[PDB]
A = this chain, B = another copy of it.
Amino acid sequence: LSTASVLAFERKLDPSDALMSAGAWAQRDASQEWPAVTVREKSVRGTISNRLKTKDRDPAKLDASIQSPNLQTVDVANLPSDADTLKVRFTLRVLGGAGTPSACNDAAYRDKLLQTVATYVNEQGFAELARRYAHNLANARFLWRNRVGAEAVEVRINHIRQGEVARTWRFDALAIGLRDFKADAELDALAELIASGLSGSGHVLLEVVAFARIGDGQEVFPSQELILDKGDKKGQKSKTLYSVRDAAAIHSQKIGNALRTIDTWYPDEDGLGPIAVEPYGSVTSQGKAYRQPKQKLDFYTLLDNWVLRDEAPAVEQQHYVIANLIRGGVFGE
């Protein structure tokens, strides 16, 4: 028995693009007609602040570079001067049926994998994973830089059963930290709903709205696009922000990456905090791979030891493997 040649997993926990709108705090219950945060342009005169090559550290060349500065156009998004609260809204569907791949070659490999995940579900439910997902919804981690230095963050989560709301959760997202996973009754009820969605025993659709009290006219941070070339035929536009229908918006993969920031079992440390679940669980902001393949704690070696050779790892690493299965991806040769 060997691993399959092609083997692919569709994602559970599908979010949408989060849209931004603006309003005043304590009108946030009437925040259905709040106007969108629009993306504008402004001019930026760039100074000289890079490290020099020290073949270019001659003072005459430096002053000649300072005398002629370069200029860009830059997309920017601010709150209005009369509104102090950013509202960010998206929808998230929890699907279930996490072990089944969407593509496979070997029948014996997918049957061994299916009974492996069946034994995992029978040992413990999705309660740890859904507890951590509900925590990452409770604290507003999906506000990436908009949460930083906010005065008050409040998350409203609506389980939507038919076209109307079935249940409502209200969270103070600054009390629920970004560091540890506590216990709370409403948080455990949300975790039970997410675990019921992940187990295939229901169809879970939630609407997540987050209100951050930042200040009047302050800068908000939508998702940022990719610029390949830049010339004078444009405005020397050097920064593009993502937008859905003239609304500053966040990419769906950004919200998804902030949802699955649950991995506290990586071997290097635990005082740093959780990271996102990746094969060779890596942080682009730190340029580093936790769970290196030289240690036996990346996703691929753990999966191959669990399925092929029946070496079941510790329950923390089993949580990590099933989290990587819910995350989805292309796993094969």
**Chain A residues close to B by CB (< 8 Å):** 5-6, 10, 14, 16-17, 19, 25-26, 40, 42-45, 47-52, 57-59, 62-63, 66-67, 69, 71, 73, 78, 80-81, 84, 89-91, 93, 95, 102-105, 107, 145, 148-149, 151, 160, 163, 203, 205, 207, 214-219, 225-226, 242, 244-245, 251-253, 278-280, 282, 284-289, 292-294, 300, 329-333
Interchain CB contact under 8 A, B217 and A17? yes
Interchain CB contact under 8 A, A218 and B57? no
Interchain CB contact under 8 A, B284 and A69? yes
Given A226-B73, A284-B47, A286-B104: A293 touches B215 (CB 8 Å cut-off): no
Interchain CB contact under 8 A, B16 and A218? yes
Interchain CB contact under 8 A, B81 and A19? yes
Interchain CB contact under 8 A, A289 and B44? no
A317: shortest Cβ distance to chain B, in Å? 18
Measured CA separation A79–B214 after assembly (Å): 30
24 interchain pairs, CB-CB under 8 A: A5-B287, A14-B219, A16-B78, A16-B217, A19-B217, A25-B163, A42-B225, A47-B278, A47-B284, A50-B330, A50-B331, A57-B294, A59-B289, A59-B293, A62-B289, A63-B288, A84-B163, A90-B217, A91-B216, A93-B215, A93-B218, A105-B286, A107-B288, A151-B205
Chain B residues, Cβ within 8 Å of A149: 14, 93, 95, 203
Chain B residues, Cβ within 8 Å of A205: 151, 215
A104: shortest Cβ distance to chain B, in Å? 7
19 other contacts beyond A62-B292, A107-B286, A207-B216, with CB at 8 A cut-off? Answer: A16-B217, A16-B218, A40-B244, A42-B225, A43-B242, A49-B279, A50-B331, A51-B331, A59-B293, A62-B293, A63-B289, A66-B284, A71-B226, A73-B226, A90-B217, A91-B215, A93-B214, A103-B286, A219-B252
A214: shortest Cβ distance to chain B, in Å? 8
Given A93-B149, A217-B16, A282-B48: A105 touches B287 (CB 8 Å cut-off): yes
Interchain CB contact under 8 A, A289 and B51? no
Measured CA separation A288–B73 after assembly (Å): 24
Interchain CB contact under 8 A, B43 and A329? no
Chain B residues, Cβ within 8 Å of A81: 16, 19, 89, 244-245
Given A63-B288, A73-B226, A163-B26: A219 touches B294 (CB 8 Å cut-off): no
A247: shortest Cβ distance to chain B, in Å? 8
Chain B residues, Cβ within 8 Å of A59: 289, 292-294
Tell which of B80, B103, B105, B332 touches A51, judged by Cβ atoms closer than 8 Å.
B332
Chain B residues, Cβ within 8 Å of A45: 226, 284
Closest 3 CB pairs of A and B: A43-B226, A16-B217, A95-B149
Chain B residues, Cβ within 8 Å of A252: 219
Measured CA separation A152–B253 after assembly (Å): 26
Nearest chain B residue, comparing its CB with the CB of A163: B25
A292: shortest Cβ distance to chain B, in Å? 5
